[PDB]
Design a protein around this nucleic acid. Structure first.
Ligand SMILES: [Mg+2]
Ligand SMILES: [Mg+2]
Ligand SMILES: [Mg+2]
Ligand SMILES: [Mg+2]
Lengths: 100, 57, 233, 102, 118
RNA sequence: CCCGGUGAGGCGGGGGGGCGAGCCGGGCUCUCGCUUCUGGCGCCAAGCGCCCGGCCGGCCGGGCGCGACCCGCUCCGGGG
RNA sequence: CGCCGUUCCGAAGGGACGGGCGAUGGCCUCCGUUGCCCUCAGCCGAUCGAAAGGGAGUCGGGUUCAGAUCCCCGAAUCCG
């Protein structure tokens, strides 16, 4: 049709898609952290993931801060055996998409 | 009287009958009427001495 | 006859002289975020070097060709909601005792019949919100040799059909009488979009600094031009 | 070891300033058209002693060039300032004591 | 229409009124603080008999949620006697004793004679 | 992207007005555009032009422009 | 889970006088009502925080086995 927008959204390193992904990311970075979108930004990826364009279906856009999960402990001091002295380089077990 | 007692008294019990009555002293009234008329007067002198200069020059 | 009472009292609006009047400040207002956002997103489309694939939507159909276009696209509007019923009735009493050629709406249908070479002219709305839906149609038309043209307004392309907005519109077939008008448009369109596609695929948009900051450069350059203009003698 | 007294000062709750009886942040007059192309004249209503501060403050009183209102401002008093003195501010202000100019 | 002030304030729009399509609760709840529930019984103690005899009052143990207004207007319904004033106090027991002082012409001793307490 | 300020209040160009260097009334460089003797007052328009609306050119009462230059893509600045 | 934050990245006022339009109740006279625009409006942060801070206005005499500036009598007083 959708198969053109699909193969287009795979050249994210191109010129047009690196301009669009950048003006989109700039505009998204100015709105709230969790706000309702009027319509699906990617209508194809939305159909593929189950979005029928009918009443009741809602699209929320949401932003999440990148990076790992620093351990929530006082200054350093995770009292335990040296195995669990790790705070900085830890990673979270759920993807940022699952947190969105 | 206390502030909230002023609702009881009559206006004559709260102001003296004069311009700026009961919100400014008489000495600074006469000594403000003076400065008002005098400054506007000098503003007139300077207004005159402006076009008096522009006449010759 | 003049009255000696009506004096003329002019005010002096100098610095510290008298209270400034209720002037106009539509430039200095603090706007809401959504207003300031869209007002300074329209500027990024003037500062950023816009690739020619998105920039090819600014060079749009003129104001004289647009009228005649929608004049021809008014004889081939789809049927309404009431005409849909009244055709089921005139088909009923037809049963008791051809389909006309019309417009064709939607990207998924225009693209699928531009590949089938069924179209004779394609109109594309110049301001599709996610532009990815019509980024490819220009090149797919040029490739298939279909006469396409970009029209200003997906809310005016959307009045042909009876919906809020439309994206594309296609003339597949036309009646006899209007085939001349269609051939008098396909000419003036193909010579403007398909013929110069080489020079459309190369033309980057945007990349233009704000006037406040182009005057600071035109002034400095002027000083260094009037330098050689005055030091030579 | 216990958090040293030096470290215990960044949290606060004891080491916060005593800003109870202070009269306000002593700041210059904000920049407007007048202060940017001419001069604006104000008077000195009084000179007060701000607590916990060696310098004195001076309530300079201008009038808003856009509304009918008398704006007060808390400057730090230059030396030689007295009450009823006239303080001018802006680019075209003359150069004497207490006369803020670029 | 020029912007005279540099502050874009939100424009006032229109606000309708509730025109429900069905009342939530079917029927208005009956007033459970009736004129009868608001007065339980009197007192027959020589601390209140000197009030009736001397002060020309009556002493009722009224409901605790009752105002001096509800009491006044609830003795002027159950007993048809205009009332001079009402003085309430919540006992350590928990009930709200109320000293009702009758109009000058009405005689407490003779309106307590009627209702029973005498 | 960051910072400061403000009730994001006159920013950038252009025009219009006055003073002086100059060429011989006309084009440019300039600059300014109205507040410095005093512990006063200062808004919510005077004025000229234009139109309309009721009662008898005349009473009454409204609106628009100038006054208060036009045009602009970031509120101004400072970083980057 | 929530925490931070209290004017800070905010379309943060549901108000007022006058006027114009509309309706209503009655000496439908003349006020009052509420609907719609026009005009005007700063603020500075929802709310909580003191029975010793701020905070209008009650005193005399009598009386009970236990309550009185609180009940009774008599004199006032503030707010609406
Ligand atoms: Mg785990
Ligand atoms: Mg409280
Ligand atoms: Mg208290
Ligand atoms: Mg107290």
């Amino acid at each position: 049709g959708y198969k053109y927008i699909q193969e287009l959204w795979r050249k994210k390193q191109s010129d047009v898609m690196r301009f669009l992904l950048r003006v989109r990311c700039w505009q998204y970075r100015q709105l709230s952290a969790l706000h309702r979108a009027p319509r699906p930004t990617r209508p194809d990826k939305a159909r593929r993931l189950g979005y029928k364009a009918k009443q009741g279906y809602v699209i929320y856009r949401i932003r999440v801060r990148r990076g790992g999960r620093k351990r929530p402990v006082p200054k350093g001091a995770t009292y335990g055996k040296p195995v669990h002295h790790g705070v900085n380089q830890l990673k979270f077990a759920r993807s940022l998409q699952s947190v969105a | 009287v206390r502030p909230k007692v002023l609702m009881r008294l009559s206006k004559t019990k709260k102001h003296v009958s004069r311009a700026y009555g009961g919100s400014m002293c008489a000495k600074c009234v006469r000594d403000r009427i003076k400065r008002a008329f005098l400054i506007e007067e000098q503003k007139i002198v300077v207004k005159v001495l402006k076009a008096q200069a522009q006449s010759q020059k | 006859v003049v009255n000696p009472l009506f004096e003329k009292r002019p005010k002096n609006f100098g610095i510290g002289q008298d209270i400034q009047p209720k002037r106009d400040l539509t430039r200095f207002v603090k706007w809401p975020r959504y207003i300031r956002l869209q007002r300074q997103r329209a500027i990024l489309y003037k500062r950023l070097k816009v690739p020619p694939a998105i920039n090819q939507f600014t060079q749009v159909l003129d104001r004289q060709t647009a009228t005649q276009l929608l004049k021809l696209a008014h004889k081939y509007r789809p049927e309404t909601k009431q005409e849909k019923k009244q055709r089921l009735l005139a088909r009923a009493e037809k049963k008791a005792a051809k389909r006309p050629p019309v417009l064709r709406a939607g990207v998924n249908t225009v693209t699928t019949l531009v590949e089938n070479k069924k179209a004779q002219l394609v109109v594309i709305a110049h301001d599709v919100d996610p532009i990815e839906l019509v980024v490819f149609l220009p090149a797919l038309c040029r490739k298939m040799g279909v006469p396409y043209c970009i029209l200003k307004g997906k809310a005016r392309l959307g009045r042909l059909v009876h919906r809020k907005t439309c994206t594309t519109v296609a003339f597949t077939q036309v009646n006899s009488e209007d085939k001349g008008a269609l051939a008098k448009l396909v000419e003036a369109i193909r010579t403007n979009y398909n013929d110069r596609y080489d020079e459309i695929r190369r033309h980057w948009g945007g990349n233009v600094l704000g006037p406040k900051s182009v005057a600071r450069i035109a002034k400095l350059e002027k000083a260094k031009a009037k330098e050689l203009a005055t030091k030579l003698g | 070891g216990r958090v040293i007294r030096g470290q215990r000062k960044g949290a606060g709750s004891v080491f916060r300033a005593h800003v109870k009886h202070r009269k306000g942040a002593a700041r210059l007059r904000a920049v407007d058209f007048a202060e940017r192309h001419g001069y604006i004249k104000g008077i000195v209503k009084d000179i007060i002693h701000d607590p916990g501060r060696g310098a004195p403050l001076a309530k300079v009183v201008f009038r808003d060039p856009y509304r009918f209102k008398k704006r007060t401002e808390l400057f730090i008093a230059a030396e030689g300032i007295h009450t009823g003195q006239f303080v001018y501010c802006g680019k075209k202000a003359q150069l004497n004591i207490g006369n803020v100019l670029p | 229409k020029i912007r005279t002030s540099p502050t874009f304030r939100r424009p006032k729009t229109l606000r309708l009124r509730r025109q429900p399509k069905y009342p939530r609760k079917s029927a208005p709840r009956r007033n459970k603080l009736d004129h009868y529930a608001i007065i339980k019984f009197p007192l027959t103690t020589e601390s209140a008999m000197k009030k009736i005899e001397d002060n020309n009052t009556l002493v009722f143990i009224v409901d605790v949620k009752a105002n001096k207004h509800q009491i006044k207007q609830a003795v002027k319904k159950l007993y048809d006697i205009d009332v001079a004033k009402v003085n309430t106090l919540i006992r350590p027991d928990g009930e709200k004793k109320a000293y009702v002082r009758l109009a000058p012409d009405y005689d407490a001793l003779d309106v307590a004679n009627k209702i029973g307490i005498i």
